[model samples]
Each structure stands twice: as structure tokens, then as C-alpha cells.
Target: MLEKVLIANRGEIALRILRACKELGIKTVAVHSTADRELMHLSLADESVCIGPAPATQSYLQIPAIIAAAEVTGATAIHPGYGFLAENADFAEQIERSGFTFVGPTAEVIRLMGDKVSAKDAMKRAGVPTVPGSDGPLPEDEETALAIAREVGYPVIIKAAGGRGMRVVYDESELIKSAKLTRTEAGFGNPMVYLEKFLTNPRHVEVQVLSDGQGNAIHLGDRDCSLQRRHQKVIEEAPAPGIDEKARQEVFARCVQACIEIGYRGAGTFEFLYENGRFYFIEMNTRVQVEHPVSEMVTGVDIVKEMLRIASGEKLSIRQEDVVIRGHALECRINAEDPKTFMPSPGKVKHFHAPGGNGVRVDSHLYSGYSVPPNYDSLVGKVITYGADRDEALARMRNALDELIVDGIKTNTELHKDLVRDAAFCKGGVNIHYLEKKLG
Candidate 1:
């Protein structure tokens, strides 16, 4: 088992990892920038190291500085608490080479699944259905690219091989231009790109899985993360309410099989676009997701602790049959922003109060006088609730939202309250586009 660990991130996620390490009796080292010295996690860590300035590029994202901190602090393992270096394949490789264990998948597996084209190809080979797209990286020439686009049909998506966002091309006229612009905009060393048939109004569903790196894997269940704004998930719920049972089962099976086929280790998520009772693969998150609390709430599993055990060479503690999804769970991402305009609100939190009571869990690092820096994401906290049924879960969430209070800084708590009471949301089965349309 890893004796000492270094956390290479900040905010609530860092606190989450630190608490897990504490429970396991593992000593933790917290690395931070000058701006985050007063962060909650730093106070809880056994030791804290100042890596660099406030800018993440020179601090949390600096691989060399992170490694140095681990080396100096005698941390045998590094837990990248989501974001930053969590999914960086090269950083994972460097950690291993520098004699430190990365509490995630192997670097080779990360590289294979990190690339969009490669990940889709692997999924297809494993018999997991994917959206109709190019078999491999798209050809650079316009004529060949046009051929692939037409083959995949119009209304195709042109995406860079190593990019964050994609562009949709509705016709042949937009194909070539979109491809060129996406490649340039992606700014990846590899100018390779691909095309896919765009699915309209699909729900963004994902399955959470854990692998022991010894050919053993199992899925916890699914999450409905369709409530998104500008491609960022706002609200997530477990069991993906209103999905076809048979299709859900198929997705779960395929995701587990994919993990075993790829020798995937640690925790990962398989994101899919569901529409018309059919599931199409979108991408896989090689690290723990932000909305993982919902799955943990429903499954009664501490995912972060499991990751630690897996990194320590432990086989999966539970088998497929041992896993059970109990009732329903919901999560609301409480961000410091204007509820209506969605503008970032970064300033002193004059007052803060979290919701409590049974089935309500608030994961946050905010305090009455804490200064929310504009340098990072606007997220201030996450409010999660679980109950014996979907109705009970929704009711508890509504109550929790009403009880949550954060003064002096603007927040989207009111928006969340309105969403839970909305007729369409209450009815469930709203597609991914539903939230955007309603907001507009």
C-alpha cells in the first residue's frame, strides 16, 4: 500500500481525496499555489507545499513541480484529484518513471483511450456500438474528407483528434471549411481529425465502472447528465430515469467488456448519447467524474477509496453480483454565478450555510469569509441527495435547495429550485436539448 500520497489538484476534489486518505490512515501532502494557501484541503493535509504562483499553468498543471513535491515529501503515490493532470497521459507516464504510482489507469491505457479516434475504434472492436463516423483519422485532403463525410451522411460533426469541442457541418459546403477550422482551432500537434453522424436531441448518459487491472471489472450503474449548459453538466442523477431497461443493461455489459478488453485499471466512465431507445458511444472519461457522488450515493461505495485500494494492488473487493443500485440519487452543481445570465460571480462569500438532514450531502470548501477567486471554475459546491425512490429523491433535493444559503455572492440556487419544479423536469425523459431550449 502507498504510505504517503501527494494531491495534485485543488478545491473540493482535493478535500474529497484528502478525507479518503485520512480514513485509510495514509499520510497526505497537499500542493498548492500562493493564491490557494488558505484552501480547506491544505489545512487538513499532513504537509503542504507551495508549488508556484496562482495561475494553474505554473502551479497545479506543472508536472515537474508536482513530481518534485512528491519526491521531497516522500509521497509514494500521487492522486490527481480530478482535472489538471488527472487525464494527462504523459504526466501519468512520468510519474511511473519517476518511481511514483499514479492512482489511476496505466499511462498506455490513458493514451489509447485519450484520443477520440483511437477510443472509438477500440470501442467498436470490443462490439460496443459507436456513432457512424470515419473508421480512423480523417484524411487531410478535402476530397477524401468529403467522401467520408458523405458516407457518414450530412449533418456530420467534424472534431479534432485531440480537441475539447467539436463543430457540426450540416451540408457538404460546410464540411471542408469546418474541418480546416476545427483542426486549426484544436491546436493539437496532431492535425488529424474525424467526422461523425450527429445525433439530434440525445440524452447524455454515462456508466461508471471500476477495474482491478487483472481482467476483472464491474459497473456501478448509470447517470443522466443531460442537464447541461454550454456542454457543461449542471445536474446529474443516478439510474438514468426513463431509460429502456434492455438498452440500459446492454450498455452496462458493453462498458464492462470494454474495460476488460483494454485492461483498464482504476475507475473510469463510459459516456454515451441515448436517443430513440438506442445508445451511441460518445467518449470515455479515464478519470473519476465530477458527478461521481450520485453513483456512490446509490451504490453505497466510496469510489475514491476503491481507487486507492486498486492502486495498492488490491483486486476488486466486490464482484458483479455484489453490486446493487439502491433507490435514486440526484446532484446539483452549485456554482457562484448569476442564475439568469450565468455570469461568473467571484468575490468574498459573506455568509455560507449548507443543507443537512438525512439523504442530503453537501461537498464544498466555501466558508463565510472565503474569497472565491476568478482564476478557476465558478463551482462553489455540490448538493447531493438520495432516497428510496425518484420522487422521494426529488422531494429531498427540493427541500435541500431551499435550505442552502450563500449570501454576498450571486448563485444559481434559484435556477436549480425552478428546474426541480418545472413540469418537463418533473415528468422526466427530457432530452439533452431540453435544458438549453428552456433556458433560452
Candidate 2:
């Protein structure tokens, strides 16, 4: 394995990666912005380096500074975790050229899969199912966008080819404007955007795939990310409850095939929209997802450790034949926000109480009397639960949420409680638009 690895991101994920490195007997180098210097993850890491000032563009996204930190710390590899520069092909290439190993796929795979339009084409070429739409991004003209939207049918979705976050329009007339806005906002000024047929109430299912460099790839099953507010996922579960067995198998097989074809290495996820007895490819996340703990809970595997091992030229510890999805697992991204208004609420956490006992896990960087700074994402922690079935998992999640308490900062704990207890969610018929239509 790697002698030492630098964690290039902050927050809970940084701590999570640091913990894994410790277990592997690998030293950890934590790179942080000036604003994140006081973050708990920094203390946990074996070594620390300040990249830049508070703004992400200057720090977390600053490729040279991150690389310099690794070079200075003698880190053999860097793990970008989930956000920040995790999926940046240029950054991955830069790291490789700088004599550092990037824990995700190659720059070639990241380039092809970073753009949604090109990604869909690649998936199709690899025999993975895709949503019906154009093969790539549309020309910057109302006529072309309108024509594509009209053909694809009304309520088509416009997405950032290089970005995420839901900013949808109802039909063709509004899509042209929505497309322009989406293109501008996604990655902020990134001109790439793709069009897709929007399913009104679709279940957001995704398959997690891992690969060793020698073309050995396997699917870790599926995650139901249907629960969301706006376009951000709030709650995610494993083994989508309502999906048919055949459909699930098809998705999993296609994902493994894609991994082999693209030579995808380390951990990646193939996101899909399943509805009305069909599955459509949305995009691929070329890194470990935020909801990875749920998969770990059910499969009894350490995904972070797997990523490090793969980067170190080690084969995957498990194979497709050995992998099995055991019980239902759920993860609630507990954030510091008002449940109803959904605004960011950042401040000191006066008290911290996390749920424990069997079948419950909490991944967080906060503790009692810690300040929840206003500089970054408002996520406080993730509360995860596992049960023998979907119902048991849902109930455990609800009870766990009730037991979670962070006194000073306003939290979305109540929101998660209500969402888990909702009848539709309990039955697992909820789809991608569940939160938008039901709550809004």
C-alpha cells in the first residue's frame, strides 16, 4: 500500500479518509484552507499543511497548492474524497505528472466521463443503458435547443454537462432559457450542457462499481437516492425497494461492463433515473459518493480502504462472486439548516449528542462546543442505519434521527424525522421528485 496519502478535501470526508489511512498503517497529510485550519479533520490527520485562503477557488480547488502540500509532506498519493477537485481530469493528470498517485480513475476516463453528454455516449458505447436524448450538448441557439426539446417531449431536463444541482424547466418553451442558465451556473461559466427527457416521478437509482487496474470490476449493488430537496440528495438507501429484480440485475451488469470498457479504476458510481419500467443513465460520479457509508453498512466493506489499496497497485480484496448486499441501509445527511426554509445555519454547536447502539453509525467532524463555521457546506453529519429489511431500516433511521441533537445550531433533524416517517417513503414508492412535489 501507499506509505503516505494526502487528503485533499475537508469536512467529515477528510476525517473519514484519515481514519482509514491510520488503519492501513499509512500516514495522512491533511491540506486545508486558512478558514478550515480549525476543523477537526485537520487535527486527526498525521500532518497538516495550509493551502490558501478561505475561498475554495484559492485553496481546495487550487491544484498547485494541493500538489505542493503533497510534495512537501512526502505523500505518495492524494485522495480527493467526494467534492472539490475529486472529479477534475486536469487535476488528476496534473497530480500524475507531478509524481503523485490520484486515488480515482485515469485522466482519460475522467475527461470522457466529466461531461454529461460525452459520458452518456461513452456509456452507450460500453453497453450501459442511457436516457433517450441527444448524444451530446446542444448548440447555443434557441432553435436547436427548442427542436431537441420538442422532439424529446415537454418537461425535458437541462443539466450542466460538467456540473450538478437541479434547475429544471417544465417544457420546451422554458428549456432554452433554462439551458443557458444551467450551462452558465454549472461549474459556473462552463459552456457544456446536455438535454434529457424528464420523467415526472422517477426513482433515482445508482450502482456503485469498483475496479482494480487489471480490469477486475464488480458492482456493490444499488442505492435509492430518490429523497432530495431541490436537486440535492438528503436521504439515500441501498437496494431500491420498488425496483424489479431483473431491472436491478441489468443495471448492475451494465455498470460492471462500463467499468471494464472504460478501464475505470478505484471507486465510481453510475447514476440512473428509473421510472415506468425503464432505466436511463444520468451521469457517473468518478469518486466515492457522500452516501458510501450506507453501502459499507450493508456490504460490511470499507470502501475508502478499497480506494487506497487500488491506488497502491493492490487487487480488490473482494470479487463479484463474493460480494452480496445483505440488509437495507439508509443515510441521512444531517445539515445545519432550518427544516422548512432550508437556509444555511452556521454557528457554534453548543451541545452534541449522537445516536448509538446496534445498527447505527454517525460520520461527522463536529463535537460538543465546536463552532459550525459559515465558510463552507452546512452539513453537520450523516446518520446511517441498517436493518434486515427496508421497513426496519426506515424505522431505525427515524428513531436514530430523534435521538440526534445539536443544541445551538438550527438543524434539519426534524425534517429528516418527518421524511422518514412519511407513508410514501415508508412504502418506498417515492421517486426523484418526492421531496420537490410533496414538500414544495
Candidate 3:
């Protein structure tokens, strides 16, 4: 029973949170950077506060400023919708410290799950599968380093050569050669190493889980957010296509067990790299993910609302068996971008058109004359479509992309349309590199 809430982030996610509040008879305080005064959520909220003018750190990432807004507005809770401060452990600590209900996990779990090393350990300790490597980040001890070499098999990865702080290892000779190169390069001429096994052209899959700290938790099926650009997912769908049913069930159950063991509360997504009928734990998101609509269509749960109810100290009403997937759903992440350059073309939307049909849904904060701000994330909208099967869902998506319109600023809808119609995409022959290869 959160009485009043502050939507702590911005854009469609903030709008999404506000909708959740209104549905539950709660009031929401709209907080934003000074750059977003014309933002629709500001006008739509009960009260609004502009936190800062320059950079997210001084604004959404600023703990005191966010706290000050909550305190001044008399908000009972803060819902960091996603991104920026969504998984920010310091903000969680501060919010709870200031006596405002933080609509997420315990600050301890937030920090714990945010770190790759501890998160991997936590998952492995719970019988969840993580990459078979050092059993932890690589350490100075030579014996265990070689122990890992034997345990993990020699033809494995050491995240060598500092390229973005990681790389793939081929064999033993190259493995030893790769390690010191990593020390020199990733070290910036200093020293350090972490390790993970590589999944060749793997798809990105994740399970959405809702938990109450009182020991009740359930996973709401899974998603394939495989189509991505710049390592950020461009599209996502529910019930990861082409996965073995038994493998999915085993991983899904382990996720529930992991939630119970780790004392996870609120809504969280456990991201995985899937290949060869196996799921490898990569990292986890300690808040509602952006591609939630597709999961919502299949599971018929308001993930954000469920998150609030859990944070309010309520037990989960739904169980594993009570939930069932009905249909395949797909979400296209609509970005304001030049169709050719693939760069964001932020400006005013002189005309806005929303597509309608029984199975189509759009999650966006756009309207005629609304300016797409240059700062912040480039995602402008999400056109989600659902149907009784994958073909229908995908079919509706292609039409939805065309019927939808955003005038003035460019959008990547053209890209989405062509992608959906591609034979490989239609057949779900999607790997992490699928979209990039198409671009080339």
C-alpha cells in the first residue's frame, strides 16, 4: 500500500510507472531534469519537480536531489522505473535510509547482484548455472589458475587483451599467450584478469521473476532479447523461440529457487546467454526491464504493479503453476534515428500516429509537437504485438510498424519493418550478431 509515489526516472518507463500508480488509486510525483519540462509525464503527473539542468549525475543520479524531491513532495515511495538509478545501490540505501519505501530489492542484494563476481558466486551457490571458469574472478594464486585451466578445459576464454576489458581464448598455447597480453593491455600496462566461457553466436535470453522478501517468489516465463545493436537489445519476444522445452523449465525453476535463496524481492530479470540447449548466467537486472510488455502479454501480470506490491511487504498471490503462457509476443524498440546512419535524430514530432488492432500495443511517450530530447536514451517508443502464435505476432508487428508514424524526426521503423520480413528473422534464426550482420 504505497500511498504516494515519485516516478524517479523519465520517458516511457516513467509514464509506464505512472499508469501503474493510477490503476491502483495511488498518486505519483513526476520528477525530471530541467531539460524535460515539456515532457508529457510532467503534465500528466499530480505534481512535478525538475531536479537539475546538466548531466544525469547532477539530476536523476543525484541521491540528495532525488531525496529532496521525494521529501518535499511528501512521497511515500520512489519507483526508479529503469535505467539511470534503477539498480543504483547507493540510491536504494539512501531512500531506505531517509525512510522512503524503495520499490525494489534490499540495498545489499542490489550491490551484490550488480557486481559480476559476487553475482556469479550467488547464482552458483544456488545451483544456478554460471560459466565454468575460475569459480570466481581470476586471482594471483598460480595453483588454482591452473586448476581452473584443467577444470574449465584448456580450449576456453580468459577475457584476454583488454579490448573493452575482455576477449576470447582459443587454446592452451594461445591461452597462456593471451593471459599476459590481457595483463598488459586490459591492465593499461598495469594488471588484472576476469574470466568467462564464450557462447558462440548465442542468443540473449532472460527470466522475469517477482518476489516478496517474506520468502515467496515465482518466475513469469522467459524472453529472447536477441536482436540487438551496440550491445543494447533492439527487439525482444516472449518464450524464447526454438529452445528445448525441458531445458527452459529446468532453468526457469532454478531462477525461482535462486530468488528464494538470494532473498531477492521486487521485480528482477536474470539475463542469460543461451546456446546448445544450455543457459549460462551472465548478469541480472535488479529492476523492471524495458522489454517487459511482451512478457506482460504472455503472463498477464502487471510487473511494475507487482513490484510495488512486493515492496509494500505483501506476499505474492500467484504461484508457478497458477501462471501459464498464452501466446507469442514481440516488441520493437522504436528509436528516433536516421534510417541510413542509425544515429538518433532527436527533434519535434510534428505528427504522431498510433496503430490499433486487437493484438497490438505501443509503449511510448510521444505526441504531435512533442520534442524528442537530445539527451538521455534514444528509445522513443515500443510497438508490441501479440497473437496466438509466433507467425501472427510477427505478422502484426510488420503491419504495425508501417501503420505507425512519427513525423519530423527519423525513426528506425524502416529497419524494423525490413527485419521482421527477413526470412531468417521470420524463422527466428536470431543470434546476438544477427542484426549486425544484416546491417553489414
Candidate 4:
């Protein structure tokens, strides 16, 4: 086990990693920018270091500074707690080259999975289902682009091959214009675009898996992150309700196989779009996700601690047969925003009270006088609930939300309340588009 670890991120995730390290008897070093001087995690860490200015480019995202902090503090391993450089292949490589263990996948694996085209190709080779799309980057010429669009059928999406901009085209004319526009908008130097059949109203489902970097990997079931606003997940639940059990099991098997094939280590997630009882691979998150709590709640696993143990060269304590999904878990992202307008709300929190009871957990760094800086993400906390079933989970969540209070800054608490009570949500199986339409 590593005697000391450096956290290369901030906010709730930083605190989450710190707590895990503390429990494992590992000392933690918190690296922060000027803006994060007052972050709660910094106070809790065994040591803290100032990396750079408030802007991320010079601070949280600075590889040299992060590496220097680790060296200075004698941190043998660096745990990038999501966001920032968590999935950055170059960052991982730098950490390895600098003689510090990166608590994630190998650099080569990260690079391969980070590229959309290569990732799809790898998944296809592993027999994982993917959305129908061009074999590779679309031809630059208009005629070939048009032909591919026709082959994929109308209502296709033109996405930059390097993963940036995307536009939906319904016909040849729109495809031509959107392809050119997307390439330029992508701004990655003559970006190549690819066509994909756009499945409307698909549910965003993802499976969480952990590997010991020695061929052992197991999944923790699936979660439905279908509820979204402007591509940001709002609510997530484990053991995706109303999904075909057989299909879910198949995806789970394929995900574990893919992890073994790619030599994936630590923690990762395979995101998929499910519609009409079919699952289409979307992308893979190479690090712990903001919505990971839902999966943890249902599976009784401490994912962060597992990551540390895996990085420490420990064999996986649990095997595939040992994994079991129990109960239903729901997570509501408590963002500092206007519930109706969804605008970022950053200010001093005058009053804060988190709900608590059996099966209710709140992960946050918020306090009554904590000042929410506008320089970062609007998320202030997450409210999670677990129960025997979906109905019980929903009931517990409703009561928990009623007890939550953040008086100073506005929040989307009411929106979550409305969503948990909505007929479509209550019936379960709400798609990615369901929440937007309901809000509209």
C-alpha cells in the first residue's frame, strides 16, 4: 500500500478521495489553486500545496505543477479525483514517467480509449455493440460524405472524428452544410467528421467495472443517467428500471470482456444508449464519474478505495461471482442554480441543512458560510438514497429532498422534487429526452 497519495483535483471528488485514503491509513496531499484556498477538502487533507492561480490552465490542469507537488510531498501515487486530468492520457504518462503511480489505466489504454474512432474500433473487435456509423473518418469530399449519409439513412448525426462538435442532418443538403460547419467549428485543424444513426429518446445507461491490472475484472451492474439538462446529468439511478434484464446482463458481460481485452485497470465506466431494448455503445469514462455513488449504493462497494488498492498492486479482493446487486439507489445532483432557468448560482451559502435518515447519504463540501465561487462548476453537493426497490427509493428521495435546505443560493431542488413525482418518471423507463420535454 502507498504510504502517501496526492489528489490532483478538487471539490466533492477531492474530499471523497481524501476520506478513502484516510480510512486506508494513507496520508493525503491536497493540491489547490488560489480560488480553492478555502475548499473543505484542503482543510481535511494531511497536507496542502498551492499549485497556481485561480484559472485551471495554470493551476489544476498544470501537469508540471501537479508533478512537482507530488515530488515535494513524497507522494508515491497521484489520485486524480475525476475531471481535470483524470482521463488525460498525457497526464497519466507524465505521472508514470515521473515515477509516480497514476491510480487509473495505463497511458496507452487511456490514449486508445480517449480517441472516439479508435475506441469504437476496439469495441467492435471485442464484439461490443456500437451505434451504426461510418467505418472511420468520413471522406472530406461532399459527394462521399453525402453517400455515407444516405447509407446510414437520414436523420444522421455528423460528429467530429476527434470528438468535438456534432450536428444533426435530415437530408443531403443539411448534411453537406452541417459537415463543413462542424469541421470548422471543431477547430482541431481540418477535423474529420463521421456519420452516425441518431436514435432519438434513448436512455443513457452505463456499467461500472473495476480491474486489478492483472486480468481480473468485474462489473457492478448498471445505472440509468437518462435524466439530463443540456447534456449534464441531473438524476441517476442504479439497476436501471424497466430495462430488459437479459440485455443488461449481456452488456455487463461484454463490458467485462472489453476491460480484459484492453487491459483496463482501476475503475472505469462504459456508457451506452439504450432504446427499444437495444444497447448502443456511446463512450467510456476512464475515471470515476460524478454519478458513481448510485452504483456504489446498490453494489455495496467502495470504488475509490478499490482504485487505491489496485494502484498499490493489490489483487482484487472480490471476484466476479462475489459481485451482487442489491436494492435501488437514486442520486440527485444538487447544483447551485436556478431551478426554472438553470442558471449558475454562485454566492455565499447563508444557511445549509442536509437531509439524513436511514439509507440517505449526502456528499458535499457545503456549509452555512461557504462561499461558492463562480469560477468553477455549479455543483455543490449530491443527495443519494437507497431502498429495497425503486418505489421505496423514490419515496425516500422525496422525503430527503423535502428536508434539504440551502437558503442563500438558489438550487434545482424543486425540479428534482417535481421529477420524482412526475407520472412518466414514476412509471419508470424515462428516456434522455423525457426530462427536457417535461421541463419545456
Q: Candidate 4, residues 1-440: lDDT per residue as tens digits?
A: 98999999999999999999999999999999998888998988999999999999989999999998999999999999788999888999998888889999989999899998789988887788687777768777878878878877778988876635768888777777787788887566657777888887699999999999898899999999999988999999998888888888888888989999999999999999997788899899999999989889998899999999999999899887888899999999999999999899988889999999999999999988888888889889999999999999999999999999998899999999998998989889888888778778
* Location of the lowest summed lDDT over 10 successive residues in candidate 1: 182-191
In angstroms, what RMSD does candidate 1 have relative to the true structure? 4.8
Rate residue 30 of model 1 by lDDT.
97
**Local distance difference test, per candidate?**
0.90, 0.85, 0.86, 0.90
Candidate 2 minimal-lDDT segment of 10 residues = 159-168
Q: Which should have the higher lDDT, number 2 or number 4?
A: 4
| TM-scores of all predicted structures | 0.88, 0.87, 0.92, 0.89
After the best TM-score superposition of candidate 1, give how far the Cα of residue 131 lies from its true spot, in angstroms.
1.5
Model 1 residue 253 CA deviation (Å) reads 1.4
The TM-score, computed over Cα atoms with residue i paired to residue i, of candidate 3 is 0.92
Residue 222 alpha-carbon offset, candidate 3, angstroms: 0.6
Cα misplacement distance, residue 158 of candidate 1 (Å): 10
What's the residue-level lDDT of 130 in candidate 3?
Answer: 76
The collision pairs in model 2 are none
Model 3, residue 144: C-alpha shift (Å): 8.3
lDDT assessment of candidate 2: 0.85
lDDT for 299 in candidate 3 is: 89
